[PDB]
Enzyme design. Sequence first.
Site, PDB file in Angstrom:
ATOM      1  N   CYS A 182      -1.757   4.041   1.058  1.00  0.00           N
ATOM      2  CA  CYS A 182      -1.161   4.240   2.301  1.00  0.00           C
ATOM      3  C   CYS A 182       0.097   4.901   2.262  1.00  0.00           C
ATOM      4  CB  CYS A 182      -1.237   2.942   3.166  1.00  0.00           C
ATOM      5  SG  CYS A 182       0.375   1.857   2.940  1.00  0.00           S
ATOM      6  N   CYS A 186       0.804  -1.139   0.132  1.00  0.00           N
ATOM      7  CA  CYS A 186       0.031  -0.088  -0.052  1.00  0.00           C
ATOM      8  C   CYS A 186       0.775   1.427  -0.011  1.00  0.00           C
ATOM      9  CB  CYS A 186      -1.057  -0.056   1.301  1.00  0.00           C
ATOM     10  SG  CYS A 186      -0.352   0.131   2.928  1.00  0.00           S
TER      11      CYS A 186
END
EC number: 3.2.2.-
Length: 252
Positions: free
Chosen positions: A157, A75
């Site tokens: 992320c 991520c």
Amino acid sequence: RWRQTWSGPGTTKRFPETVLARCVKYTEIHPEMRHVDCQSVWDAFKGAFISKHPCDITEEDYQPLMKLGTQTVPCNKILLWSRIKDLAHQFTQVQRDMFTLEDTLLGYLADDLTWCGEFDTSKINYQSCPDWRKDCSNNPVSVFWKTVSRRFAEAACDVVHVMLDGSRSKIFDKDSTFGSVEVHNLQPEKVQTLEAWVIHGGREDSRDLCQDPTIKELESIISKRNIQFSCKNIYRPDKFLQCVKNPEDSSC
Ligand SMILES: *[C@H]1O[C@H](OP(=O)(O)OCCc2ccccc2)[C@@H](O)[C@@H]1F
């Protein structure tokens, strides 16, 4: 017979065979996704749009495909791009630890392809498919990209990077898929920073394009989501790719 139903390009020729082969090839290049049953993937892909009115597609129609194509990519290694597909892909082919949407199985299957069905028949429309603007927005192609781009942005992320086309009239076009779907799906619980790389074109290196109004508009939106914003200029994308390929070059 002389009348075509839609304004846009029809389904790419041999779409069924092409989707299946791309799945086989992807599962071969990437072992972590080898658990995928490629026939089942095609079946669910097909099931999303076949026999449906090509103006009535929903994200829900694509959910079974979304399930089969479940894939966790690091991520923290995500590269977004808006309207600068080529260099972004050229980047991830060298810098293999980073992923654009099209480096996922689902993105890889659909990349550069067009497809649609016919209301209440089993046929794929090889002649024409709805144009997003001229016809209707809830078409098999547009709805697919919306669905996958949302999930991909939602999985992002840490530091998320975005490559943008500095040579365009709107470098950040809040109407793009980046602007309308991806940006607003960057969760501040997950995403610390959005860093933009603004790709200049040619010998146009006299300006800080991070100062462009649309980039300030992006900065403002990102900050209002409680996310840090960073922007870098890439003046020489030609030399950029080279430095990514051979980091040992003293020139970078
Ligand atoms: C998700 O979407 C991104 O693509 P995009 O280039 O931002 O949008 C498609 C082009 C467009 C431009 C103006 C208006 C509508 C659409 C990629 O980073 C990712 F795949």
